[PDB]
Design a protein around this ligand. Structure first.
Ligand SMILES: *[C@@H]1O[C@H](CO)[C@@H](O)[C@H](O)[C@H]1O
Ligand SMILES: [Ca+2]
Ligand SMILES: [Ca+2]
Ligand SMILES: [Ca+2]
Length: 536
């Protein structure tokens, strides 16, 4: 297999509104982001996933884009963007632009010209209809919004202020590619293609994900954009099996670098139930099955897979699958080690490296996410009490991932110098902040640092195969094997003392959050024990 720069990279995702504020309005800035590039470089990340900073009414907080080639003035101007690119480049860090091309804002020029002047060419950039079907919006209600000015329903799989783009229109596609080339020529490191599995939509036939012309569109995109350059393109794929992932990310097909898939995330809720009917107790054997499926059936050279616990749309991994009290940091290290020592590109969400958690939202007002608000308003008149709803949201609501980045124990955790922040800062910033994590030599942060370094310096993380070992239910253990080399990874995914019935000859320790000698000797693991050792 022929390697690329991103085959040894670890990606750090920054949520701009909640990273660092430097003008005291309670919202994060581009300058705030640039001011922490030394911290990110110290962490050892190679690429930064930058959540949308484009012009937006912020209906879906940046994912309703009104202009792809302008910076929202709440984040600064284009000069700030270019400066961020430059300063990150100087520190060996590439910027990966988050991109939404399935739909735009309704305040985007294309749509404005489209519902005005229905004789425009922009009219066909969007999906217009006379006789709507039963397609529902992911954020609730119908997917068709009746515009009474033009007497036509337009398609929106998300909010009504997020009309879908018509990807059967090659001219629209062309303009998209024009924008992409615009950002590419600004010297970015790649793209995160959000929801990109939806561009092959045929709404008339009730087709959303995995369309028939999907990979043709992705091939066209590649050939017209990043296909010539050397960029990391990660696509978010909802309908994703290992074979589909192959179709997406096999280097021969000339489409994407890798996929971003949520099958293991699906274990956060009951089978085929809405994500609001959550499950705290993680089914670790199920996670073993899924992880093994994606580690084995996605062979080297035939595709590449992403490694992630959480992002801006998910609950922080500690609140859903980890520990938030006694073994908080230990559980965080355990999960980190567990995920990062598999094959693929690991993704770290901001604050995960210090082990941040979900926020204790008590009432509906202090929320912001349109998805949570819609779910709440529906469920309230659908037999659910406000307390049940608030519990469900406290567990699963996306706002839990969008609370300000906790840096220190200053005002607003050193995120902002304003009276209030756009979202509340979690009180645990008393204990959970970047300064304190940096001070402690053996903190979660340095575990992530060590993992990222091991990924940078050692080829086996890319080269070694994967073999699942038969352990206890809540014990996740595997082998990375390549040539003479054999690496054992052992992680106790439990709050309780578990069993380890194995004998190995330990040659050296690569990483450990506990006494691995004790665990190997007494054949039993303490809660959240995790290590990686080289064995003979
Ligand atoms: C993908 O796009 C959706 C819709 O704009 C947004 O809500 C998510 O946050 C993003 O990941
Ligand atoms: Ca600001
Ligand atoms: Ca009318
Ligand atoms: Ca102030």
């Amino acid at each position: 297999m022929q390697k690329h720069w991103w085959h040894k990279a670890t990606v750090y995702q920054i949520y701009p509104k909640s990273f660092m504020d430097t003008n005291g309005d309670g919202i994060g800035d581009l300058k705030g982001i640039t001011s922490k590039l030394d911290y990110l470089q110290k962490l050892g990340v190679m690429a930064i996933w930058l959540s949308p900073v484009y012009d937006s009414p912020m209906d879906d907080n940046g994912y309703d884009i009104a202009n792809y080639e302008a910076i929202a003035d709440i984040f600064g101007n284009m000069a700030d963007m270019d400066n961020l690119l430059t300063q990150a480049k100087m520190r060996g860090i590439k910027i990966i632009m988050d991109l939404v091309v399935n739909h735009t804002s309704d305040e985007h020029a294309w749509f404005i010209e489209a519902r005005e002047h229905p004789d425009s060419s922009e009219r066909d950039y969007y999906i217009w209809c006379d006789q709507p079907n039963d397609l529902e919006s992911i954020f609730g209600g119908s997917a068709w919004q009746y515009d009474d000015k033009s007497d036509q329903y337009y398609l929106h799989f998300f909010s009504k202020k997020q009309p879908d783009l018509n990807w059967e229109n090659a001219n629209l596609r062309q303009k998209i590619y024009d924008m992409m080339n615009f950002w590419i020529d600004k010297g970015i490191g790649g793209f995160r293609m959000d929801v990109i599995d939806m561009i092959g939509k045929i709404p008339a036939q009730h087709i959303v994900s995995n369309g028939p012309k999907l990979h043709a569109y992705l091939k066209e995109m590649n050939a017209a954009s990043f296909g010539q350059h050397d960029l990391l393109t990660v696509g978010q794929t909802w309908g994703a099996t290992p074979e589909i992932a192959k179709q997406y990310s096999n280097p021969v097909n000339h489409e994407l670098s890798m996929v971003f898939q949520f099958e293991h995330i699906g274990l956060q809720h009951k089978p085929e139930a809405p994500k609001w009917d959550y499950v705290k107790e993680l089914n670790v054997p199920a996670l073993k099955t899924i992880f093994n499926k994606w580690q084995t059936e996605l062979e080297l050279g035939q595709g590449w897979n992403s490694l992630f616990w959480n992002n801006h749309d998910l609950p922080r991994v500690l609140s859903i699958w980890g520990n938030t009290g006694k073994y908080r940091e230990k559980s965080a290290k355990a999960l980190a080690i567990l995920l990062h020592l598999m094959r693929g590109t690991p993704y770290i969400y901001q604050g995960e490296e210090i082990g941040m958690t979900n926020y204790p939202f008590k009432d509906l007002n202090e929320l912001d996410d349109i998805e949570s608000l819609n779910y709440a308003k529906e469920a309230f008149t659908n037999g659910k009490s406000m307390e049940t709803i608030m519990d469900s949201i406290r567990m699963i609501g996306r706002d839990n991932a969008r609370t300000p980045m906790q840096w220190d124990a200053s005002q607003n955790a050193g995120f902002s110098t304003a009276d209030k922040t756009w979202l509340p800062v979690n009180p645990n910033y008393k204990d959970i902040n970047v300064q304190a994590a940096l001070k402690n030599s053996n903190s979660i942060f340095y575990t992530y640092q060590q993992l990222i370094q091991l990924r940078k310096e050692n080829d086996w993380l890319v080269d070694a195969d994967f073999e699942l070992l038969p352990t206890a239910d809540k014990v996740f253990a595997y082998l990375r094997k390549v040539r003479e080399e054999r690496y054992l990874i052992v992680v106790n995914v439990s709050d309780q003392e578990e069993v380890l019935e194995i004998d190995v000859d330990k040659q050296e320790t690569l990483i450990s959050n506990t006494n691995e000698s004790a665990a190997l000797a007494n054949h039993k693991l303490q809660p959240w024990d995790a290590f990686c050792i080289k064995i003979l």
